[PDB]
Amino acid sequence: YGKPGPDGPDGPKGKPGPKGKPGKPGKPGKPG
């Protein structure tokens, strides 16, 4: 029989990740 066939193509790109988590809460305000 003949030569082995060429490698198949790369798979498709995965889906985008989830939204990031919310930022860190601000520090407490100054009494002043």
Partner: protein
């Protein structure tokens, strides 16, 4: 004999990682 057929497509890539954190909140207002 003839060359073999092309291989199957690879698996789908893994879904992406989570987005970057939101920006840190500002400090509270003064009293």
């Amino acid at each position: 004999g003839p060359d073999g057929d092309p291989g199957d497509p690879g698996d789908p890539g893994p879904d992406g990682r989570p987005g970057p954190d939101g920006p840190d909140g500002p400090a509270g207002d003064p009293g």
